[PDB]
Amino acid sequence: MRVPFSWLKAYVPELESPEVLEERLAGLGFETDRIERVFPIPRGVVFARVLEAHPIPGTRLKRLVLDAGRTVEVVSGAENARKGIGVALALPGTELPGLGQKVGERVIQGVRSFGMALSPRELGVGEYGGGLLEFPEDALPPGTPLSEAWPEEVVLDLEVTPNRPDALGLLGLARDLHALGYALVEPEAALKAEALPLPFALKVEDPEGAPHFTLGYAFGLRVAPSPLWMQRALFAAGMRPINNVVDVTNYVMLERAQPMHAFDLRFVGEGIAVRRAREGERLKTLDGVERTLHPEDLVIAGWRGEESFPLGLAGVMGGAESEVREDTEAIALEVACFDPVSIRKTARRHGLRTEASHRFERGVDPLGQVPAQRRALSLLQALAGARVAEALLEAGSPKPPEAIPFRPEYANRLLGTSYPEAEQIAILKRLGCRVEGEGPTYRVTPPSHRLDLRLEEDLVEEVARIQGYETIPLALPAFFPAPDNRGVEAPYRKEQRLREVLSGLGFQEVYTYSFMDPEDARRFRLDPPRLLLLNPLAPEKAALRTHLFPGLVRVLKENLDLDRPERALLFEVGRVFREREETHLAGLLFGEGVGLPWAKERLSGYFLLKGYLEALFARLGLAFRVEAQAFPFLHPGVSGRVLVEGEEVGFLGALHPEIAQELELPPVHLFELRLPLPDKPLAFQDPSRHPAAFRDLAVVVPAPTPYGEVEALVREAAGPYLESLALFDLYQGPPLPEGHKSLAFHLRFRHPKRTLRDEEVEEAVSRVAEALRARGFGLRGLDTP
Amino acid sequence: IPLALPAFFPAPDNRGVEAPYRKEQRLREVLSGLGFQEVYTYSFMDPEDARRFRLDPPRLLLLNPLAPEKAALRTHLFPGLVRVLKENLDLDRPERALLFEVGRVFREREETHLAGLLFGEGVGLPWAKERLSGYFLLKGYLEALFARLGLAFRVEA
Amino acid sequence: GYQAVEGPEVESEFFNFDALNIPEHHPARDMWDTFWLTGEGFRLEGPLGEEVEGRLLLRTHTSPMQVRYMVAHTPPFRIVVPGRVFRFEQTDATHEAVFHQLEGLVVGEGIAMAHLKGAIYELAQALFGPDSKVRFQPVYFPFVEPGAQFAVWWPEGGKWLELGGAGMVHPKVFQAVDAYRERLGLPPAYRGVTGFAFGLGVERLAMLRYGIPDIRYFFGGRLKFLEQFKGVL
Amino acid sequence: RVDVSLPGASLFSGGLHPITLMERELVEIFRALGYQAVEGPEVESEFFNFDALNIPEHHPARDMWDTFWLTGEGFRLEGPLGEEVEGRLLLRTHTSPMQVRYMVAHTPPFRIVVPGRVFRFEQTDATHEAVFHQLEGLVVGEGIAMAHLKGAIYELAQALFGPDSKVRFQPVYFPFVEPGAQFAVWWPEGGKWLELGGAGMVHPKVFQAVDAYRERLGLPPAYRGVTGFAFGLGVERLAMLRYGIPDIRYFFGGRLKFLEQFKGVL
Ligand SMILES: N[C@@H](Cc1cccc(O)c1)C(=O)O
Ligand SMILES: N[C@@H](Cc1cccc(O)c1)C(=O)O
């Protein structure tokens, strides 16, 4: 919200400076995003009187005859270029910022232009470059330098927040400061109003979309250009001046967060009617855009006879036709409080955002309409000659704000401060509030303009910001947390330890986007996403991931293309969506492998990652087996599921060839599972002292039977005094009964209280070689020291 | 006597006071993760070991040791490790092991020491022969531990 | 003394917006550019683990968790909740659609703003040295009053870092909690307590602390990038 | 067939010592209440280990700790500010000494916990050790009180044995504290009080010792108008009744069939 320093200094005369202001606002709650010095006007730029505009035969240019102290001529091709107005004459020589060239006395179409009059863009005061500036013909004495009436200005680009719509008025800001201790100068409505009827009427057909509506009658209007001060203040704040009346409505808008439109009576007819727009009704908004209203678009309409027509879109933009101009002589002035959600939806609806909509979407002073009238009318009387109707057309009667209970002791007890009572009360009063009672608990009723003030709290933050957030001491709480909060972090910790143990062991952590590409459920072969986006960033990011593993495979590819990693062992941990939101852990292998940099023999593939995982678990102290089971995305020959503590929790295996072939990737192993992994308690096993009994044999199994089944078997029956079972050699071929295999198994038995006899082991082994053969498995050897 | 808890802004110089103790743990952990088994050896040394393991004798001794074997204060962490390896091989027959201990060693100054010994068949496939072990195994393990700690690391003879 | 609890990334508009005094068609709603989800066959459980209804979305902040926790537990307590949050925005050098946050909420009898100011201070020291200082400026947030944004001074860089926002919990957020409370058979717990909460963006810090120039990097999953942090601690 | 139930590349699975575990557990517990952790040197100078801690010579108190005396030429033992210090060397009988080193090196208020190896000349059996770790905590600052000691030991009970665990305080003698006492925690599961450690409010003379050794170094007095409490407890005990380890001797036996059983733990 461009905040022109010189302007705001009119309500707050005692301001120290731009900088001190930025400092003061920031404390009040408003952070400035920038400060700018704006009106550098050279000396060559004098104020001139257009004595007579003459057209140039054959051209669309006019030869102006100016009174700039002395009589000079200037060629111009501007639609507003006319006699009777004052211009910004940049004499020959002047260097202008708006044309990066030196202004000279050049010859244009048979007439030599002694300089040139300028547009808001050529002078630099504004972006508009479609016509000269128009000032009162007597603004300054002919010739006097414009600078002498248009000093540079400093403008703070302020930040007003939803909670402070009153702050959308320079005088709203100006009141916040007044509470800081500054002096406030509110302008007065010098009105000479006369008793007489209003040549029109008001009919509010929609009291919901316009809870309070007023109109004021001003006639005798002498539409001309606004005085240099106003054009300046307007220009500085971001708006372009148009003429008396029009400007006076913008100014007051900005001055007090109260949008107001001046409707030329010529088009009002018998009256103004505030009502929803009839389906298809058309309207030519001020922006010269032809629109087609909608039934919900509250409108300002005039009616003649039995005809009802749209005069402008209520609290967003007026009609291009009712718009005040040169020949206007009377108007009907809109000054009302519209309904937030309506204006909101309407604006959105037509893709309009304006000073007016903006303030109505945020809110307006429920009882500000009448006073806003006086301000505006008084101005019109002074700047336009306006005669004014001592009365107004007011529809609606909002209720004053309600009293909020306020205990200073709470102000403090909440802030941790200790400002004395009297100091608190006065702060509120400075801000406008009315304070009743004598304590402890008081009755505070905010001013109508403070929509943010409802609770006691909002009221404590009122003391807070005016005393200074900085005047709030530091402290630290001490208390025994409540029981149920005890242990509350086991889960978050439990995860970290896992990420760490993983980060240690040798896995690189990754961070993939939660988003999925619906087309991937197909590529990577997966049941489609159960959740999607009504507004994705892109089609590729239109769904929510169901598996963590595809993001991994994709990075692998994305890496192989930027840098050529010869290997990689990643892992990611994130939330995956499907039926329920669940935390997932996964990481893919890949690359040459693990071995000697100068040697060939290497370790990699399935078993590398399969070993890595067995480690990670032995480390976590969790049981872990991996039984084969096909998976769409995995390889058929290389694929199985994960079993932590005897319960399935995910899969482990090599990617599927085709998926690789379709992705242009080499064999990429990987796995995925679901956390929180099984939690197993410690059953301390006081180790036996006595020596163990070593044992050996190789079970003869048919090529198909998975190592797992064999093992589980051997173990299952390997007596209760077994210590270790371990496969050291896996052979198959001659002379074995072809199509089979023998598994070298290292065993050890150990009794805790005493040593074991050969009879206890020789008999305890026959138990496992019997159930082994009773299953269909043989025996290569047995008992080998 | 009621229960309570204090609340106060610690004094500045106390700030950061734990970097060191933490720094060690992360290291013990990163090590415990990577694949090393932690050990706890007695601070005491056997004067006769400076001879056996070939080391300049102990700079500190005890006017009242528990035993002659525990009469000095260790100068190196590594002998306790080698000894456990032996002590293990005799009770249970570990076919391999990758230990590591971290403790205070005495000599000239008291200093914190990190060390661990390799040993065993190695790292490979339980049913296959091709294996990895010896010097380079432990030499690799260490390069990891460092790449992980983000520290340069070379080993000149 | 703050314990750490996580929340679910897919939230129900009730927690993410209504429990946090952020109504609909409200200007506040505009501070967060929401991501709306649509899916049949999705169970989203609440505090006590029951089934809950609401218009699904990806959380725009972590605050919601501040409500889930309070119905599931009773004061006093201190918690910090880290997590992934989403916003419909255009991803550039210093902006992201997916980025983590950290919320902290301390509630209990007698709590005060002084204590909020104290904890943010302790975070400054712990993070930027004894020569680092904190600054508090009043700002608007529907879930807190008084509320504000806070900046830390980073002596080395010699410039204030707008870190996050915070304030004292809004009376209505407790009402929402106690309300949703009775509706579950649980008795009111936050009638006579006070609390403050703050929330701050990770990626920002992590950036001016590991000297990472482009925020986009975090998710780019590039190795020549993630490796550069292997050491860090 | 391309089996998958088959064993993988036997990579080494790390682990951690029962004590590192039980020590960390304890550290984190106290870190959460604001205590920072600092270590001390195992070889101490009788000044810190005994005289700074108001334990004079040929004093009955000296008997509570059965000291290990060292003898060696060519040994530099640095103190607080890192300077050279003289005294009759010994292996610390507790961790308290560090409570003095810290206070001269820093200024109140502060909270610290110091874990560490301590030695005692005793006979090593099932529930006794010559080498065993301890944990000291010391919180000093204006206004500190015994209530706060009682509070912190409570918070340790909860954090360690559940909401149904309670603490007990009995008056006992310690030269470095007055009032002083031993404290026991109730272990609901085991259903019996565990004499955990000792503690009390720091002795006026321990501050005097600190401030004295302070000026002697050019540093100004810091503990003239503060108060503080400190406690110290034995690890191995806990770790034992918490991991169900029957014989204390195990911790140092360096046996693998033993240390491995804790690889999981957290
Ligand atoms: N768009 C109008 C301002 C306005 C304000 C309120 C209601 C309206 O219909 C119009 C203008 O151009 O001044
Ligand atoms: N939820 C806010 C940050 C915030 C502010 C105040 C208190 C909080 O708990 C959190 C945001 O994301 O912008």
Ligand SMILES: N[C@@H](Cc1cccc(O)c1)C(=O)O
């Ligand atoms: N140093 C005592 C334990 C103790 C008692 C009181 C306070 C402390 O800081 C320590 C011992 O080892 O017996």
